[PDB]
Amino acid sequence: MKFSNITIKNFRNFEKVNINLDNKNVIFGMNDIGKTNFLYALRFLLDKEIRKFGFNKSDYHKHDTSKKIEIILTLDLSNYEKDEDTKKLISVVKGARTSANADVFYIALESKYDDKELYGNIILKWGSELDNLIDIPGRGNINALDNVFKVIYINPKIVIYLIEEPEISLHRSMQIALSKQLFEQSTYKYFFLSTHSPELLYEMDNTRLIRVHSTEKVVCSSHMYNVEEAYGSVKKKLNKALSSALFAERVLLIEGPSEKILFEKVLDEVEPEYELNGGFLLEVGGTYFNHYVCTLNDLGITHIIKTDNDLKSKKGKKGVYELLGLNRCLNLLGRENLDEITIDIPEDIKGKKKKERLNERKKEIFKQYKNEVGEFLGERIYLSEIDLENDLYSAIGESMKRIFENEDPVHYLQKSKLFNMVELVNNLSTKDCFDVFEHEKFACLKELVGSDRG
Amino acid sequence: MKFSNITIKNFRNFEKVNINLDNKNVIFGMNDIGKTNFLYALRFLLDKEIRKFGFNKSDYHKHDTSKKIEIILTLDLSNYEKDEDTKKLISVVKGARTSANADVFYIALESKYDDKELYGNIILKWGSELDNLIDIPGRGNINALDNVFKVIYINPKIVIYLIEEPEISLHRSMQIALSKQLFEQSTYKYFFLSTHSPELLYEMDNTRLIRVHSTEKVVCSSHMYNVEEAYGSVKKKLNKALSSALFAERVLLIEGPSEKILFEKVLDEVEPEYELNGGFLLEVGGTYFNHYVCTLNDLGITHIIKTDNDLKSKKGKKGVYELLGLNRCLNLLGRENLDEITIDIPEDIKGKKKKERLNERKKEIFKQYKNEVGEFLGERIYLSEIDLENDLYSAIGESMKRIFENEDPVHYLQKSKLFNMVELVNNLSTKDCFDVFEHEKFACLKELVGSDRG
Amino acid sequence: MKFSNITIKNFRNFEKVNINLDNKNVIFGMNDIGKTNFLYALRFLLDKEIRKFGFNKSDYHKHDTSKKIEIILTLDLSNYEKDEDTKKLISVVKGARTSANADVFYIALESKYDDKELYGNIILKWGSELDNLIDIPGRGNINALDNVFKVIYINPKIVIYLIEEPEISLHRSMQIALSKQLFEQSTYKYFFLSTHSPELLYEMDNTRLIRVHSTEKVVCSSHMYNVEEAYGSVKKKLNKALSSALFAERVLLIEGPSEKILFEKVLDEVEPEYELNGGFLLEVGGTYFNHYVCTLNDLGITHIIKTDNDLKSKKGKKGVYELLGLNRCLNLLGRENLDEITIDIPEDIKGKKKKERLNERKKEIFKQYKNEVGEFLGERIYLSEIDLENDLYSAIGESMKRIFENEDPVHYLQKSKLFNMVELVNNLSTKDCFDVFEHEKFACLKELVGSDRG
Amino acid sequence: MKFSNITIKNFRNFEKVNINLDNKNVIFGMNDIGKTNFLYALRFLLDKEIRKFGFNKSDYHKHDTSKKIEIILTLDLSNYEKDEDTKKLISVVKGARTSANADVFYIALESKYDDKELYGNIILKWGSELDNLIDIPGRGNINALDNVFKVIYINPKIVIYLIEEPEISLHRSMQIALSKQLFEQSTYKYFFLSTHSPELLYEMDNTRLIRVHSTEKVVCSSHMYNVEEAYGSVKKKLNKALSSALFAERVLLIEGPSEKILFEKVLDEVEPEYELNGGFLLEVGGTYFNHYVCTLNDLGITHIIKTDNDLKSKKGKKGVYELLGLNRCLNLLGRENLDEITIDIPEDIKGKKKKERLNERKKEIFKQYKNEVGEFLGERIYLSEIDLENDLYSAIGESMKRIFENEDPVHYLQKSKLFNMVELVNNLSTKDCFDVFEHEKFACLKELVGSDRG
């Protein structure tokens, strides 16, 4: 058995929502009322201790309008022959599946109007098809649906867990321990989890991620999160980086710590983001962008990428290079990897002349694929012509020639990436941070901020 | 007026504790009962709503032993021009202090025995000296101490705020907003704050940090946290890095993301629960170590440093280099910076021979200062001879020659730091990570784990 | 429809109890737990707010023994023209009862075992006969039984009221007002009432009185209380006298205030705690005893009768007298009244000789009917030979000659019944009251106390 | 020590009340809020658990007007030298009584305004005189007044009990037991008791009775209730009669059960809700009226008396009679008893003519003392000329001649008091009950009803 989707037609703030499901569902977002009402909708469907009180006047969409509450759950009855849960579900629902080739099962919840005697009268029905459902029989206080499912609710037979906000008064090491227990152990086969803590998502895999949007109207996006076998050795940094970005509205994907130093200085001088959200800065280095981009795109989070046009030399060869920075953006657009170029160079001196020759090659590569660069710019993908250091020289190069006594200030900062960046940031003023922010090669910061003039 | 220290001579789980204070005090740690009882001790000293109920039997260290509760607060009254709160404390407390030469002031709490009549009878006294205190006069239900101080308690006249766990059911952007309001606005002049969330400490300055140790016996370490004017341009990254490290037991200070990739691969193969038991990896890049080390040392957190012997060339000068990797560790040991050396290198080729000459000079430098290196190993400071890549080649170099078709994998892995390290991690087995973990040049990982063979 | 009886086959202190019912049921007694659980048994039968929680482990007679709870209510459904409630019960319960020849109708409750899964699972069934009951159909949270009956519970569709202890913090005039509203108004057609206050019973008629016995085992006696049209002009005195006697264990029925004054003096000298242990003195004068005796006998209260052999003259006729004192006891034994006698007395003097002739006639009538006197003594009926004053002279006559200067104290004490008896009580000692108490003509006091020597 | 009075000068419904006190105080009445606030005023004076919360805004007289709450208690410090409670009070109040001849002690409560800081600040002071009170010294949370007194509050050192409504869910035999314990045992030396049940007053003596009047404005009447040694043998009957009359507004004092039969039939035909509005019929026989009348007069209950002009013969002498009916009313007005009169009557036949001669003597006696009869009529005292059956014959005598076959229906009613009055009441209509009610010899019933319709 595998939960597929739940449709809630009328509830406290749900109107016609459909949320795709899996086993191991996780819900998060700004709307705490929507997450609480999602868990209470599950409790009304599958827990008798909540269902026995019926529906009140307050638990309709408007308080006297659209008096038909429907909650329907899809179950995917077709499975393997050897699993116990499918057969133990089928053995209770006898007259349900009229055909033995039935693949989909439905558990429905109907409600009467609240005007009659100030009561709701929840009525439950199964059936293997949406039309022609039949009633769930029960002799007394107990339904036949209660014989199959058990619901355990946590707040500080087939078993479904509902964990609400377990990080309250909890140290972060115990949150990481609970994350490992939730997503690795076989005890929690079916659960629904709501949280605000990114430390509960450091170990996460084969889970359905549900994001509830910031609006008062409940909007839900669902993504089926898997980590494939290629990223198994870099899974921990990937999950630790992405878990804090899941709680953001706007995420800028950058390479390393020196870009974070520069962008945090520029943002602290321009907009300290006490008025704004203050979206996330995400460090992505050594991998491709497709995993983060599909995860954030299916969840409704806007993704901004600034990258450099790198030329990676091949291993064990001479004079051949890969178009890695172009290939990552082409993989983002869904294209295939380009062929490798061959660069023939004399020896001469190999210190400083080779970087100039490679920079000229990067310039003419940037000239060749300008249409693909415009297609990257159609999305929020920003590919530098050579490197971000050259863009910084094109923005604030007079200040860089003032601070650094060398005739060129680029190579002095390339020769020590982290240490010289702090020296430039220390001697950096308010005027030229705005010069960086207003430049046309730093529009990624403008998209990350997302400012409105008024 | 500035709070200096509070001494609690007998209370429900305190024995003889003495905690130094400031304005803007922050308390954190594993022992939640100790933090709650610290806030209750402050409420018993300064809040009449807690004093009017008196002391029970349970408000004692052992439930009958050493029945004399003393809570004494030191104030350091006399300033000349600093504030108006000193004068409004003088004008009410005219009795014991008359001369302006008295600089130190005391507010003392005493309790009677609970053996007979089942009551505590909290008695309060002021006085400018520890001997010869005099009673606080009060005509009815109200003391004269209540005219000076006001206490506001938050849980989800001179004014003192007591905020207990404000991050409960709170999104992390609002935690950052509350941190900025707590440590930048002038509304919260005096407060005591307890928290589990690192997002409430992204903006912190001029504050007293109190750490409560993991033991059942209450041990408190207090540090006066300031950020000086040199680190003002890198303050936000530094605070964001240090706030998560404040909630750990063992912290390893590393340089950048390549070290993090390699070390989390090695740790995930060897001990995948290092974050559960209190380990943390801290990226420190572009600054000196002393600001992190003094903060972690005064709070009782063990600090481990893994660094490389770098040569830093100056700006505008040719042939002179800085012994910066030695200089950071010498600054950690409280010593002055070494003088700059001169290296004479001919024209030749600048690519590969220059690196070999610099590595040879680093080997001679490492041989010259071996006594200082042994003193660095006396503390938890680990300085490599050349680089981490050479130590990795000394550990798993046959594996690196197997993965990489180049005969020298050190140069190939140093051409692209981030992408080639992910490639090495991808084709890495369980046998290689134990070879890295058991090597003598990677004892920092053993100190971070904390396991001792003998 | 008229409530007939309820049988509770297993409940938290009921074993096989069977209580006859009517409309307007009143329950009282020492066992407060039994009254509370009687009202809870009614709530478990007829209220969905109590049924929806089911049965616990504590809702059983012994906590594991005889796990089959049955609560069955009989209704005597079929009338021809009496009310409209019968037709509105037929119209919903069309299934089991179709013919109009079925006069008796049943509402049955059954419960499952609480051994496994910790639930009771109350199951309800109707049917016009005890065998072959059928289930009550209900589509959702609501039964078809809930459509007919409504239950309103008071504690400081056919409607049943359940009033529990309404006299709490209530002035006694409002208790009499609630009594008049409960037993005269047509709003409370069906109710069950529990009380400790006799002021709630000053207006009672056409009601079923249920007494719960003082034992821990629940014993219930039911009496159908009516006041006939003969006692309609003295109804308020019978109700006010009997309401306080309903809360007693032993009741002595006396004539007037002289007997009460003498017996309260004697009891205050001998056993001053007769009211604490359950004794009561009831004044009955001018009526027959049968209305009190049948009510007290059906409720399990022991009744003791002390009376005098009076001769009652008729109106308008001379020389004919009625044997009223014999006739009341003969009516108590279910026998017809004796025929009138004729006494021939000459003119003579009418003051003192006439009383002696009447006393001699009373002595010879007492000699004639000694077998009937012995049968009265078989029950708790005590008939004096002439008068109580002669028995007092036969007990303490020397004391009466000492107090009163007249040689015959019987005539003097009979000239003024109230003022001379107070004079005899005033000059009375402890020795005289024990002489009255131990005399053979005052065994009614020994039966009222209840102490038996052997 | 003995409590004398408590003055409450501003409280939540008290304005300037003075209530005289003794030991063993009992408070009752319609105003439940006034009794509850009287007990709260005692708790605010003498209980630290109520003083430590202070005064709110609501517990002032109006919600802002006359913000000066004063509660003062008087104690009678003069006592015998062997008394312990006086000595243990004096040993704590050291500087209180400036003279050793001080007889009166004061315990005073004062309050501050609640306009600022929203606090009451209860301040307590002793002193042996109303001017020049001094503060109660207390070092911490505890006053010196708390060392002397202990307060125990009951709701379903010198020790004061406060029992509020103990008859709730209590059987009446336990109420009589608690009454005997409260008023006979020496455990409850000091108490204040509030009740609604007359069964808690069956044993009562040496107590202060406080009645709270039916108005919303708190009016309190206090009476010192004692039973003298003359009524010690009729004490139980007297207390059982008076306890139910203490909860009434208008009380008619009648002789025996025949008058109760007649008057309660007449009231059931005329004013069926006489007891609902505060009427009560009290049987007084064989005693004088003064003990009931002084108790009801000091408590503010209106007393109505209907009595007959009886002639009682004297022991041991022939022909002398007492004017008992005149003497009881003269004792009510505070006059001495009249001398006995002598009637010389020959032997003749003493059946019927003797009663006629005695009735003629009663008529001329009624003619002699007509001025005293008018003075009795000035109060609510009604004395018949001969007897009540003669007034009944003067009212409805035609009906009595219709029912009774005798030409003289008075003597047929006199020869059997109880059975013939029931026979008259049985054959009694609505018309002649209004004839009894409207007659000028039955104005006591009109005063008993007493409805000011206008």
Residue (of B376, B298, B381, B369) closest to B338 by Cα position: B369
Q: C109 is written with which tokens? A: 């409750």
C156 vs C163, C170, D168, D273, CA distance in Å? 9, 10, 11, 25
Residue pair B195/B167 in contact (Cβ under 8 Å)? The answer is yes
> Which stretches does DSSP call E strand in B207-314?
207-212, 220-225, 250-254, 279-283, 302-308, 312-313
Strand partners, A221: A211
Task: Give a three-class secondary structure readout of chain A.
Answer: CCCCEEEECCCCCCCCEEEECCCCEEEEECCHHHHHHHHHHHHHHHCHHHHCCCCCCCCCCECCECCCCEEEEECCCCCCCCCHHHHHHHCCCCCCCCCCCCCCCEEEEECCCCCCCCCCCCEEEEECCCCCCEECCCCCCCCCCCCCEEEEEECCCEEEEEEECCCCCCCHHHHHHHHHHHHHCCCCCCEEEECCCHHHHCCCCCEEEEEECCCCCCCEEEEEECCCHHHCCCHHHHHHHHHHHCCCCEEEEECCHHHHHHHHHHHHHHCCCCCCCCCEEEECCCCCCHHHHHHHHHCCCEEEEEECCCCEECCCCCCEEECHHHHHHHHHCCCCCCCCEECCCCCCCCCCHHHHHHHHHHHHHHHHCHHHHHHHHHCCEEECCCCHHHHHHHHHHHHHHHHCCCCCCHHHHHCCHHHHHHHHHHCCCHHHHHHHHCCHHHHHHHHHHCCCCC
Strand partners, C214: none
Residues 6 or more apart whose Cβ sits within 8 Å of residue A244 = A198, A280, B172
CA distance C384 to C405: 26
Q: Which amino acid is at C127?
A: G
CA distance C211 to C220: 6
Q: Which positions in chain A have a beta carbon within 8 angstroms of at least one beta carbon in chain C?
A: 51-54, 112, 119-124, 135, 139-142
Residue pair C382/C443 in contact (Cβ under 8 Å)? The answer is yes
A289 vs A231, A294, D422, CA distance in Å? 12, 9, 109
Phi, psi dihedrals of residue A178, rounded to the nearest 5°: -65, -35
Residue (of B70, B108, B76) closest to B89 by Cα position: B76
Residue (of D311, D327, D397, D313) closest to D360 by Cα position: D311
Strands D302-307 and D279-283, bridge-based pairing: unpaired
Q: Which amino acid is at D4?
A: S
Directed axis angle between helix B290-298 and helix B235-245, to 10°?
30
Q: Which of C52, C122, C135 sits opposite A52 (nearest CB)?
A: C52
Q: C181 is written with which tokens? A: 């509203």
DSSP A62: B
Residues 6 or more apart whose Cβ sits within 8 Å of residue B189 = B23, B159
Rounded to a whole number of angstroms, the distance between the first and last alpha carbons of chain D is 50
D230 vs A15, A255, C271, D287, CA distance in Å? 87, 111, 22, 10
Per the CB < 8 Å rule, is C141 touching A54? yes
For tokens 């020289």, name the residue.
A393
Check residue A344 and give left, alpha or beta (phi > 0: left; psi -120 to 50: alpha): beta
Question: 3-state DSSP call for residue A366?
Answer: helix
Resolution (A): 2.7
Q: Which CATH architecture has domain B5-225?
A: 3-Layer(aba) Sandwich (3.40)
For tokens 């116990």, name the residue.
A84
CA distance C159 to C191: 9
Check residue B202 and give left, alpha or beta (phi > 0: left; psi -120 to 50: alpha): alpha
CB atoms within 10 A of CB B110: 17
Q: Which of A244, A286, A406 sits opposite B419 (nearest CB)?
A: A286
Q: What was the experiment behind these coordinates? A: cryo-EM
CA distance C342 to B345: 163
Give one DSSP letter per residue of C202-242, joined into a string. SS--SEEEEEE-SSSS--EEEEEE---GGGTTSHHHHHHHH
The answer to whether the annotation marks B364 as part of a ligand binding site is no
> How many residue pairs bridge chain B and chain D with CB atoms within 8 Å of each other?
37
CA angle C163, C167, C170 (to 5 degrees): 135
Measured over the CA atoms of residue C200, residue C204, residue C209 and residue C211, the dihedral's sign is: positive
For tokens 């007959």, name the residue.
D308
Strands B302-308 and B381-384, bridge-based pairing: parallel
Q: What would you measure as the largest C-alpha separation in chain D, in angstroms?
A: 95
Phi, psi dihedrals of residue C415, rounded to the nearest 5°: -65, -40
Which residues does chain D have within 8 Å of residue C32's beta carbon, measured at their own beta carbons? 169
Q: Which of C196, C260, C416 sits opposite D237 (nearest CB)?
A: C260
Per the CB < 8 Å rule, is B261 touching A234? yes
Q: A90 is written with which tokens? A: 């089928």
Strands A220-225 and A207-212, bridge-based pairing: antiparallel
Residues 6 or more apart whose Cβ sits within 8 Å of residue B94 = none
Check residue D54 and give left, alpha or beta (phi > 0: left; psi -120 to 50: alpha): left
CA distance C217 to chain D (A): 19
Which residues does chain B have within 8 Å of residue A173's beta carbon, measured at their own beta carbons? 247, 275-278
CA angle B285, B287, B290 (to 5 degrees): 115
CA distance D321 to B30: 101
Rounded to a whole number of angstroms, the distance between the first and last alpha carbons of chain C is 52
For tokens 């009290």, name the residue.
D282
Residue pair C448/C304 in contact (Cβ under 8 Å)? The answer is yes
Per the CB < 8 Å rule, is C119 touching A139? no
Q: Which amino acid is at A373?
A: V
Q: Which positions in chain C have a beta carbon within 8 angstroms of at least one beta carbon in chain A?
A: 51-54, 112, 119-124, 135, 139-142
Residue (of D32, D42, D33, D27) closest to D13 by Cα position: D33
Question: 3-state DSSP call for residue B282?
Answer: strand
Residue pair A340/A314 in contact (Cβ under 8 Å)? The answer is yes
Per the CB < 8 Å rule, is A141 touching C135? no
CA distance A153 to A166: 11
> Which stretches does DSSP call E strand in C24-81?
25-29, 70-74
CA distance C297 to C304: 11
C168 vs A350, C155, C243, CA distance in Å? 104, 9, 18
Q: Which of B54, B135, B142 sits opposite D141 (nearest CB)?
A: B54
CA distance D254 to D267: 15
Q: A207 is written with which tokens? A: 């889970």
Strand partners, C192: C25, C162
> How many residue pairs bridge chain C and chain D with CB atoms within 8 Å of each other?
146
Residue (of B45, B10, B59, B202) closest to B124 by Cα position: B45
Looking at B315-416, list the stretches that DSSP marks H as alpha helix, in order from N- to C-terminal side: 324-332, 353-368, 370-378, 388-403, 409-415
CA distance D73 to D44: 12
Residue of C nearest to A134 (CA): C139
CA distance D101 to chain B (A): 30
CA distance A441 to A397: 14
B122 vs B46, B108, B125, D50, CA distance in Å? 12, 10, 10, 18
Per the CB < 8 Å rule, is A53 touching C51? no
CA distance A193 to chain B (A): 14
Per the CB < 8 Å rule, is B419 touching A324? yes
CA distance C421 to C256: 12
Give one DSSP letter per residue of A220-285, joined into a string. EEEEEE---GGGSSSHHHHHHHHHHHTT-SEEEEE-SHHHHHHHHHHHHHH--SSSS---EEEE--
Strand partners, A196: none
For tokens 């039935």, name the residue.
A102
Residues 6 or more apart whose Cβ sits within 8 Å of residue D217 = D13, D15
Residue pair D91/D77 in contact (Cβ under 8 Å)? The answer is no
Q: Which CATH architecture has domain C5-226?
A: 3-Layer(aba) Sandwich (3.40)
Q: Any idea where the domains of chain B sit in the sequence?
A: 5-225, 233-449
Question: 3-state DSSP call for residue C383?
Answer: strand
* DSSP H or E run through D306: strand D302-307
CA D437 to chain centre: 27
For tokens 């009549």, name the residue.
B117
Residue pair C367/C345 in contact (Cβ under 8 Å)? The answer is no
D90 vs D22, D77, D127, CA distance in Å? 20, 8, 12
CA distance D110 to D70: 5
Strand partners, B7: B18, B72
Residues 6 or more apart whose Cβ sits within 8 Å of residue C449 = C250, C267, C271, C274, C277, C279
Q: A21 is written with which tokens? A: 């499901």
Per the CB < 8 Å rule, is A255 touching B418? yes
Question: 3-state DSSP call for residue B109?
Answer: strand
CA distance A92 to A88: 7
Residue of C nearest to A137 (CA): C139
Q: Which of A264, A313, A415 sits opposite B415 (nearest CB)?
A: A313
CA distance C114 to C68: 10
CA distance A203 to A181: 9
Residue pair C69/C55 in contact (Cβ under 8 Å)? The answer is yes
Residue of B nearest to A317 (CA): B406
Strand partners, C322: C312
Residues 6 or more apart whose Cβ sits within 8 Å of residue A439 = A391, A394, A395
CB atoms within 10 A of CB C411: 14
CA distance B150 to chain A (A): 27
Give one DSSP letter per residue of B42-74, joined into a string. HHHHH-HHHHTT---SSSSSSSSSS---EEEEE
Residue (of A444, A395, A402) closest to A423 by Cα position: A402
Strands A191-194 and A158-164, bridge-based pairing: parallel
C249 vs B356, C208, C277, C290, C449, CA distance in Å? 115, 19, 8, 18, 10
Half-sphere exposure of D159 (CA within 13 A, CB side): 8
